[PDB]
Symmetry: D2
Subunit: 255 residues, 4 copies
Amino acid sequence: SMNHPDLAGKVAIVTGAGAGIGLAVARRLADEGCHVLCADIDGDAADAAATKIGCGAAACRVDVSDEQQIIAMVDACVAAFGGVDKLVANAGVVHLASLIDTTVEDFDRVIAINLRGAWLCTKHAAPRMIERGGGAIVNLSSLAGQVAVGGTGAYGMSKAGIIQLSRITAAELRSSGIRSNTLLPAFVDTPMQQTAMAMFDGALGGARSMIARLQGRMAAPEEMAGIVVFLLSDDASMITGTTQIADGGTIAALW
Amino acid sequence: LAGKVAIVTGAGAGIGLAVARRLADEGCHVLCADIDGDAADAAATKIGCGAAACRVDVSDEQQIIAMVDACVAAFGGVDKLVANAGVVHLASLIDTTVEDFDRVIAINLRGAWLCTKHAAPRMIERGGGAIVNLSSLAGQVAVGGTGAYGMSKAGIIQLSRITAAELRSSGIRSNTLLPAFVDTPMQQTAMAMFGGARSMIARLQGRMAAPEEMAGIVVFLLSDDASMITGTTQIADGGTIAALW
Amino acid sequence: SMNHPDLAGKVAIVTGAGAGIGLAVARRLADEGCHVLCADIDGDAADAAATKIGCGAAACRVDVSDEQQIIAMVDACVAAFGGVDKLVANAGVVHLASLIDTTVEDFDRVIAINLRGAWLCTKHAAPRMIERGGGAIVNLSSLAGQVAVGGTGAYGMSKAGIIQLSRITAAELRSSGIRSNTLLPAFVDTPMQQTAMAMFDGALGGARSMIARLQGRMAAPEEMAGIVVFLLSDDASMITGTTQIADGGTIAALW
Amino acid sequence: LAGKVAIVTGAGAGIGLAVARRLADEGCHVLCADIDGDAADAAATKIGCGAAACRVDVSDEQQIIAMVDACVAAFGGVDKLVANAGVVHLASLIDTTVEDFDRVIAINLRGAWLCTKHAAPRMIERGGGAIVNLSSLAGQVAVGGTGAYGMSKAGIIQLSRITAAELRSSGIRSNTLLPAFVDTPMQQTAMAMFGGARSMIARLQGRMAAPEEMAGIVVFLLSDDASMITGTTQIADGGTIAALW
């Protein structure tokens, strides 16, 4: 576990901060001296995150499928802490259906919340970062956005779109002092994926053994948070437009 | 590929037209689908050899279903699909509007998916088939201005992988073609917003590619010569991303 | 199966043309109207390939670990057919050992034959191609050169080096009219890999079932030859410095 | 990382020196290995805090074995390894000689492998460890002139994957760092053969990177914060390959 003094007094917005990776990201950032706006679709969970964290952190409710609500989030961060230095777009949904059974309604929702949402956070965060002299962004994608996982079509399509979001953000805002990188976790112990791992094949492992074989073990959300906080830090001054693979080796070999 | 039935979306102009003509030269029955019915008819007419024309708005699932059915009615079934329908949009990430984002995704990514969603069951009925989704180098490397476009093209790259994955056991293959700079009306309009176009092309890619050059790759990807190629991202960029030029 | 009239009367050198992918490449090229020099470490196998093929094709012996022998190969192709338009570097060895047990002697041999060999073929082929107004090259690598396969360290290191060979060849010779691309087959029915698949784990599939799960089925060498001949053709005019994955989907998903 | 033991090859100058100093700031015992013994001593002396110096020619397996043993003797064992030793060579693909190719491979690729070969058993004896192999953007994207160099750097990228694969169950992680343009003597000499250096750097990467900036990534990759990062190729190129610049 490493420290970053460049993060003391910085302001960060974390979306999906109510549970899992986002709650883990919010708490780690607070411990680095950040002012954190914990945003979530579930208003109570957001309040509860800020309550767990302390460190003067604040909460707000955001449905990242609505642009106006994203604008109101950034406004609230500015009004609570004076500006915006860091962004972690982590809000998202998982959806499971074969590619040929997925409905348009489901696809639209998954693209709106995941892809359109991550973009809109960058669209309204970045202007405020430019005023501060630069900033850092991490969008959470998934291994399913670069490698196929059966049943994750819509989801995977949205998560691929996020991987490219970071590149185009890096390209367009590097001369404004802004960095953007994508984090690709594989299998993490969080409520969001617990819905997903209900997927049980004709074999009794297949989640438990699937995950052990591919990744070695289940990942703790805390292990993704240390990566996110590194990527937001000045130790990552030379890292922009990259896909950070944090999959415990999953795609490094034939397992 | 003689005797095979192919649907090509955006067949009215550009790569789609070169792809349709080229599949026709290979003995293939071709349904030319386009949002412009006159371009569709004009293409089918230009090609001549059995090709049918069809008007499709790939933002509308119902019309995509009708297009596949039209191809079954005209030709018996469906063996090959080339999803080339698309739109370009230019605007910075921060100046892009929700409406333009939604429309670019709807047409490019959703449309490409829906085309596979409904063509694939017909390929299953035939014992298998092959899909080539047309994306862009801009779906993998950021070109400034091309946010919503690029994001949608990136998602198509992933469409092909998930398709290949779930449908391999049904004998269906899917790959993405990533052209860079090709002489087409869709692009020429785009590129006309000018390290500017002319010299970038010469330097990265060597010269502008013809739509025909792309067509011969599509056809290769659709053929039994590509029988062990599936879920891949095919780069036809003249070296652009291979080197620091 | 598709045709290419642009290949009639073209001259191709195929190394490792005695068996497997190379024999398959040589025979397909002959059927496209190519003059083929079938080169192999095993002189008899080379003669026998040219004998199977007919079509005026010729044979020569080459140990691609020796530069002089590579020079003599190109000389013989020039003397037999007048020049050199196409190259397929396919000569190679497989070696199996854990990364920590591999000897220097074994590493050196595997790098010399695979990596140094493919390079040297390009070094002495390319000048002759430049005289003809351009040309095409395919180097055979392996999925093991981009993804880890346990026991293939040296081999995999050499095969990665080949993937980059193509990029640097494309870069340096594009303005001379020369294209270079790498083919990455996974699991093919050839004698070269049959040594490899003797690798049997604590489970009875593990080759048979390993290969079915990952790739769907065993690949026929003929299926790699159609890809090589495409890549050498003018239908690939816009393809240079790429890694052609012909793995039947192996790395497209979590299998 | 306090209390951990690290071997850094090529610690005498450049990224290696920044890596050694930076691990020292983190409470880590460091063996500074370099082909130049004076640079090794000078580095260990500059750092001061327990660091030992060691002369190594990574083309020679026997000296690599002695280096690991020296680190065990000095500090008890080995937890971390940073293989940064290397040489640059410039020559076109067709003008490169077998001798220069052999030497570049020997030092860069073989040397990096041998360092892992012998350090890893010591990491196993400790319950695990972490490796960072230093490669180059030139190992993935072709820079003209850099053939043998690039080929060797590409192989290192694969070293890290096979290492991660076979050694994950022993608690060992391995990753590659791919810097682009960093202000170091090794590079400055290289880059001095001048779309030329100054402007390419500004355009692709934004500015030249400091060796320190690279060091902080190495340290991150060696830390328990990177506990779910293994077999990866870490890109620290300031955006170079993310966009068409």
